[PDB]
Paper text:
Here, we describe a general computational strategy for designing multi-component bifaceted protein nanomaterials with two distinctly addressable sides. The method centers on docking pseudosymmetric heterooligomeric building blocks in architectures with dihedral symmetry and designing an asymmetric protein-protein interface between them. Functionalization of the two distinct faces of the nanoparticles with de novo protein minibinders enabled specific colocalization of two populations of polystyrene microparticles coated with target protein receptors.
However, if the dihedral interface is instead asymmetric, the resultant pseudo-D5 complexes could not assemble until two different heterotrimers are mixed, yielding bifaceted nanomaterials in which each of the six independent subunits could be uniquely functionalized. We refer to this pseudo-D5 (pD5) architecture as (ABC)5-(ABD)5 to indicate its bifaceted nature and hierarchical assembly from heterotrimeric building blocks. To design bifaceted pseudo-D5 nanoparticles, we leveraged a 15-subunit substructure of a recently described pseudosymmetric icosahedral assembly. This ring-like substructure, called CrownC5-1, comprises five copies of a pseudosymmetric trimer with three-fold symmetry at the backbone level but distinct amino acid sequences for each subunit (“ABC” heterotrimers). A previously designed interface between the A and B chains drives assembly of the heterotrimers into the 15-subunit substructure with five-fold rotational symmetry, leaving the C-terminal end of the C subunits free for the design of an additional interface. We docked two full-length CrownC5-1 assemblies against each other by sampling rotation and translation along the five-fold axis to generate 30-subunit assemblies with D5 symmetry. The pseudosymmetric, 30-subunit bifaceted nanoparticles we described do not, to our knowledge, resemble any known naturally occurring or engineered protein complexes. We note that even though we only displayed minibinders on the B subunits, all six of the subunits in the bifaceted (ABC)5-(ABD)5 nanoparticles reported here are uniquely addressable.
Numbering used by the authors:
A (entry chain D), B (entry chain N): 1 to 316
C (entry chain d): 1 to 274
The structure:
Amino acid sequence: LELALKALQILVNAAYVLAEIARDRGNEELLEKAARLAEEAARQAERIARQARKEGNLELALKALQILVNAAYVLAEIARDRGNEELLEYAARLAEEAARQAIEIWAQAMEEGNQQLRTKAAHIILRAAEVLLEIARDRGNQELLEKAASLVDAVAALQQAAAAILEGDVEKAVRAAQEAVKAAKEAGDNDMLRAVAIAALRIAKEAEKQGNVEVAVKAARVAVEAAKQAGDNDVLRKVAEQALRIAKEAEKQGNVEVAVKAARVAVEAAKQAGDNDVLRKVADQALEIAKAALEQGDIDVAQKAMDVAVEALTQA
Amino acid sequence: PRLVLRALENMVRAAHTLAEIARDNGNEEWLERAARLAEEVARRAERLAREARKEGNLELALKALQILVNAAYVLAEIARDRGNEEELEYAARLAEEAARQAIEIAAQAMEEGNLELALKALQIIVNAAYVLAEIARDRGNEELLEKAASLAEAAAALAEAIAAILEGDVEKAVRAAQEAVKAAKEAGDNDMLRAVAIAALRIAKEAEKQGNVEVAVKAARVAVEAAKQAGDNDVLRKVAEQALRIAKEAEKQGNVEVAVKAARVAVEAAKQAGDNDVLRKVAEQALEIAKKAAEQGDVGVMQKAMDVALRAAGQA
Amino acid sequence: PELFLQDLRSLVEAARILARLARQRGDEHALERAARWAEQAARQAERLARQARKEGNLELALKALQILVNAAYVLAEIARDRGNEELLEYAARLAEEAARQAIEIAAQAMEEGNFELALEALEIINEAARVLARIAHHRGNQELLEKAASLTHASAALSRAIAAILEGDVEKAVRAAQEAVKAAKEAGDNDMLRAVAIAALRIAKEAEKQGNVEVAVKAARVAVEAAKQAGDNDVLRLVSERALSIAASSVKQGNYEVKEKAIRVAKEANKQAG
């Protein structure tokens, strides 16, 4: 199994050397041969990546993506002196689909808590953006500069958020996450937003263990901001479960104001999901929140709670 | 062992920094120092590499070759900015000789069946081609440039063939091998031809495990095509033995046409080799092939078995 | 823990890419982002690097110093094109004390005979010297460029001496040490001189292990030269102790002349120590 990637890396390196050797010479036939070598290697690497993803070895898959990114770099280096856009058109589309798959890998790694994949995947995505940036540096497409820059700074935020998670600093986590949605929303990439949202779930899971619900609701408010773009129903239900858990913790803390803001986030998501069981659970939780707000005499919070309860229950 | 490789590599890396610093400053004396250091490393590393193969550890040897290739890269970077022909000649000789030794490793590695070492050696060869070409362009020699390119193409085909050996598509393997002999025959490099033949032998061994004698003969047809340029007597002997093994399987399959083609290859090789024991063993089996051609009643095949066996015997 | 360095590397790579992109697309807030990201990553690395010497995992420490050098390359790239000398001065101070700390680590590794770490620290030193030279090329300091050539020369010499010791090629080691002490004189740094003296001590220790007392006297003659130029009394004490090892070994080998040299060397080391 594994040796194929090693051979493919050598093939891409051979193609790189062949292209460099040809570069100063009137022999586009060598460049064509190098491109044929690269294309076969790329087709092999994609087929391997598809199978490795089915088998669940993410390291083999991301290494194949690393090779593919190097191949895209070579294809661009060929294409430039060849004066050919179609090679760039293949390479950029391939690199975008590779970046998508790498982001999907990064999301699965974040979901599973595999930091060890997370670092590798980040380096791969960063290299993919570098190759897209070389393509943009030549081709002059401004949108690709926006895509690359936003992808990169979003990865930098995603990394910063993971570092904040390991450090346990929920305030740093929120600070990062706000910029993360800012970048991803300016990019308009729904798959980048999906990866951000999956990370935001992990932020919330740890924020409950820290018990700072007042920060955790600000994180949840970012989480719905992304999730409302992405629309993945099981992710939205997972988010809603976390928002309800956050409300239960806010009740244990007696912080009904944070609990009502947690419900205001929860309804924003539940109104997309349409899951009547979430609507029932939200109304039940909101009644417990109203009971706590009555017991505290926080009746402005009680009325705000029940405004949100009606807004939720009326979606049934 | 291990430490000395690290140290010499670090001494080359130091020379690389020193050459960068010297070229940035425009200083001569630092290049002279660097060159003295690099030559001393080259002399030491040649000894180390020669000893490492005598110790039988091909990995230590190929790492030492990579040190020599790093040294060659540094020497070339110095020399091509220094502007002297003897320096460039010495660098070219060093890189070429290292590549010879690397192919000798690759041949041995494929003969043992460790493709991992062979792949590593192909990376070394690819690196040497890059260095050689950079020398050759700046010197001005089209013959060496063409030699580098054709060697690199042949290496790329060998890498593709190794990938095909991992994958098990013997038609893909033959398709690669056809290009490999095309490049190798254009280059006239004896060791490259040797490597192709050794690869073809292991391709045939896998084709026999699969029972695909037909494609095994197609591979052997390339193997003799290469061997006929080069006169590696023991490789010719191994090819003939394989051709007889293939013919014995073709007899077991009752494919007397494939068996006669296997003999047709065997005599073509034996005609170069002149080995009387091979010739008699070949003719001995050639009568078994003729016997089976008669048992099948295949007139034209039996006429070919006649013609082959008689021409084989007629001067043996 | 280790993943921290990988994440820091990724943030440096992001900064590198952002800087590359910013050289295409005009935004001073991309420069400011990259600089802030990079400096914070560098300070985070520095905290860990200071901690790692207390933890005694020198492998993680020198890996962190490699991160510092790699970050310093990106900082210098940003700074030189942004045209700010104070950020270059900061990056230079970061690199300089990092490399000086690497020289201390290398001295421990050579005292241990843990030459593995010494070669890697010497690599960090080489790459630091590269980055220092890149900075100096823009500042115009020929003095720093001569020091970089000296530093690379000395690190190469230490590497060569180590290689000769691992091989047991002790006459070539003694010859290489004689080159190394001249390289230390070119460098003019007491910490490099200490590292070179620690190497010279470890070199003499190998000759004592072999019982080659005359080779050891040659090695000690270099070691005491380095120690005399350094002025470090602890080194001079260690040299005097090793010289008495050689003297006792010389009486064990039954030769009065090698004893006499070894005692005169011990007395030179004592005369400098006071």
